[model samples]
Target chain A: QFFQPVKPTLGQIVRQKLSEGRKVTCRLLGVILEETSPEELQKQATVRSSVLEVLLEITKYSDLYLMERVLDDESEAKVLQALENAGVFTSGGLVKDKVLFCSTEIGRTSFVRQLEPDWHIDTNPEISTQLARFIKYQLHVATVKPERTAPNVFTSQSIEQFFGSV
Target chain B: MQASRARLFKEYKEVQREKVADPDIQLICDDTNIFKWTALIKGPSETPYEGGVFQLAFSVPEPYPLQPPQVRFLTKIFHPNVHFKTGEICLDILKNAWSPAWTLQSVCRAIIALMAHPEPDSPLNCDSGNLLRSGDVRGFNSMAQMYTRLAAMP
Candidate 1:
């Protein structure tokens, strides 16, 4: 009676939502979790906690929307938290995309001569590769809608009249 | 269960070896795990990804081949069904259209065909999904060409 407000986990929300008859479409998520192993959960216990609570609540209360191997960054944290907290997991994008073997090689001055300012780069190659992949993603998106390069009637008349600098 | 898992590895590896021997699919492996084999899908001369070295990972369940394995793209390639930003694959066989009769050959060929013509209807990548759903063929095609060029680079 003297405690502060506590966050509701995924399970609480699921139970509240499904009084007796649960929605069939989404029951698959809960069903899958029902069959998960403890060893699997120990593997997923290293992410933000709040989101994990929510992930569990989703499966318990609502239907599954296929979170396995296909969740965003924020979603991954939440789902991981939920699975770890619940002591069960459905093997989502978190477990799916783990970099199993990571290599670390400290750079030595004896190895290479740094003549230029930007030439000596200290970076994690794995993260760099991932970043390159992300850059490609952004480039792909930017190519969608062409910019003001094509001077349309609205652009030609409005921009010239409004800014006057052009 | 462990025994079965080991057996699955042996079985799947045999299948993989057979497929590689076929020579049409130049399968490459940088790691020992059969579940995580890498391959280069030579884009059929006409397709936009002709020169692209599409790196993918095949991650299967822990207990070997009891469950169907998953394949995800490492490099960002433009496919209507594939989510470029996250590399979430929307292959039919991987999700729902799977059958016990499926073979490694089927999986490889399906991916190749998917490379040529992406199915926007069921997409893991939201941007590509919306772009294709909006019937922006030129936009999608241009994006595919750009990614193909990027992947081709060393």
Candidate 2:
């Protein structure tokens, strides 16, 4: 039977690539977490609740991972404690086991490729460019009015901004 | 690892400073591992589990408080919401309904509440659920009490 293409639910479209049992992996910096830069993370790491609803929604249908790099023990501690206080995981859609931490930009990129997620999110141009060949799709968090890095790489100013703009 | 440990330490301090008020609830943990813990919840009154002490283990991972801890009953519990053999729980808050707003102490309170009022709608133990729904309160309570007596030792 033929029918008009219906407006897809945000959930279905956000995870459409994974419609056939595909997995998802995401970076923590500038994506899931509020901290956008390594310097900011060194100061403190916090989850911007603006994107929280989206994150929780993704957890329901995707194997989500939050990864980032921190400068010191204190920095890591801040992010961990802040996240616990945020109740991000308590809502039950996400878990601590899915969170990852690393020490470099490539470390985060390697994590994405190693996991081979259907979709990846990040803010680094270099990493996103490098990832185009490996990842099925990518979301590059941007600050310059929005632009798609490539046919496969979509861009938005912030994590929340991406969800809102889309 | 030390950074992760610090976050656990912070939670430990808060739990201690608050001094969990439930007299029937007790928290135990290894000296070095605060993430892995065991909690004891005594059955509430006016229920078949009145005298039984239900034990549960907690496995808190990094980024906790943001995430729900992994919890399972250590002592054998005879209730609709809890598994009979593995002690796995069918509680909502332990799964999809969990909120970061909940603390470890609050989790224990929820367990006690579950014991006081079991939900027969969705059950992990079919026998208890069936018995509860069959209008056989006496049979279910007696069986629950008997199982509690056998396995609820401290």
Candidate 3:
């Protein structure tokens, strides 16, 4: 008799969706990396270690595409460097091309739609609002939980916090 | 998506062709749902379960070439890596170590290998692990063979 599966890991949660042919797209700023606001991304790229294990795990079973809107090339390079250091590229699922970049939030939304990810994780509520109709599920990462933007949208403080660590 | 369907169709065709080579393994599938299946695996020649045939279920997820099948033994056998009553086995290919390159035949081959060599260090069954760890090969074999004969009758 198999028991009710224990509380699922982030990877399991993502896997359940991907089993339905769902792909994943995530915003890098604040969600994967620690640069909660764009200004901090300009200063330095520091990846939150807490999220790497789960990200790597999710990437193993699903196509994880990460996109972010950055101010300049330096921040873009910094984000790539941070991800590379975190083993995102070496993990074998995420490729350099899958890490997308854009100048505007709308461009990021375009990236999500272009990729057709069933699950999208973004720190910005505006992006989630725009994507709620198009995407199947959106994880809105925010410090203070607001009323859910939509039925398909869920709230989490951070990626690691939302999915318990490895 | 057409390519994925093509690949899975090719894989299914290959399994049919290879089925003759592996006599000990047999598969049952629904007419429409090739992703869900039931299989029978004869125990390895040199293992304690040599004469038994184990039953199993397999579910291949969407985009399977990129994902692994969810598999569990249907027959209850005493083993370290397998859950005592549930028949869930601890194997890498069924989880994080899975790659699109593997086929159902390969997955079955891995399950046979696990049956032949139980990993006592990471046992899903504590009693089985203890028997192995305590250096009781004879006792472990007796218990494993008993369970195999009793529950793995094909």
Candidate 4:
């Protein structure tokens, strides 16, 4: 009985939390990419370095799809290039094909519905609200504190932050 | 009954094919009994277990795919999650977390991973566990390396 209580590491916690879900869908704009809006993608897209590790870990276990609403074909290319440059594709668990792009917010919502993921993560409160009943779980990422709308919904500032890595 | 033996045979063939590819771990089964197996795993580099060869014994049950194989260390090791005297291991996959999809070879890899990441908080070896919990890295490393050299060499 001398053994001390165990504390799970950040990586272990992340893996355990997502372990039940076989399919996961996450929006790239604010949650994964540094740019919060699609308009920012018109210039350059930057993948949040802090989120890369968590994203890769999710990809290792789940059928993960990263989607974002972009204005033009050029923005799509920018987003893909940024992800490529960030070394997300190097692990081979995540492919460029799985990174989807849409022109409207509703289009992104439609994509998540079509995929029917066990977990959905997004910065848009509206999308999280809309899919609350359909998805098993949803993570709403926001910088400001927001009221918990549903029992199944969880709130985090960022993906990695939720795992206590930041 | 037949399915267990058939599955074991399939795993045996796969292990034989992968034998040359991965030198880090090797699983050997008795010719007369496929239920029991012995594995020789090389200690990963950059750890106290480096330069050591550890042996593990496994006992597969009748409802194997539904249940996890019982595994214990045959070679002595100094680690928090392993029993110093009994060679019993405290690993999740070997118990409640086990999935039917996991194979014996994958379990070997998971054991290797446990060697690298010792959970001092949930230790079976209180002495080794205390050293890590007290943040005595040097003390833990020296004792672990000394034990590895003494009992797990070659």
Residue A92 Cα positional deviation in candidate 4, in Å, after optimal superposition: 4.7
Q: Tell me each candidate's TM-score.
A: 0.43, 0.45, 0.47, 0.49
* Model 3 vs. true fold: TM: 0.47
- Output the better candidate (1/4) by TM-score: 4
lDDT comparing candidate 4 with the true structure: 0.81
Model-by-model DockQ, in order: 0.03, 0.01, 0.01, 0.01
lDDT: worst 10-residue window of model 4 chain B? B134-143
Error of 2 at B19 (Å): 43
Runs in model 4 with CA error above 4 Å? A1-9, A164-166, B1-154
User: Which residue pairs clash in candidate 3?
Assistant: none
Q: Candidate 2 on A37-149: residue-level lDDT in tens?
A: 76887777788887776666677777666666655557666777776777767554666645665555565664565457878888778888888998887878777734447
Better of 2 and 4 by TM-score: 4
lDDT of 4 by residue, A71-114 (tens): 77788799989999988885647877567655556555655664
Clash count (model 2, backbone only): 6
Model 1's C-alpha root-mean-square deviation from the true structure amounts to 22.5
For model 2 chain A, the run of ten residues with the poorest summed lDDT: A13-22
Residues B5-91, model 3: lDDT tens digits: 676788677767763764877766657886787888899988889999998898878777787888998888888899867889899
lDDT of model 3 at position B146: 58
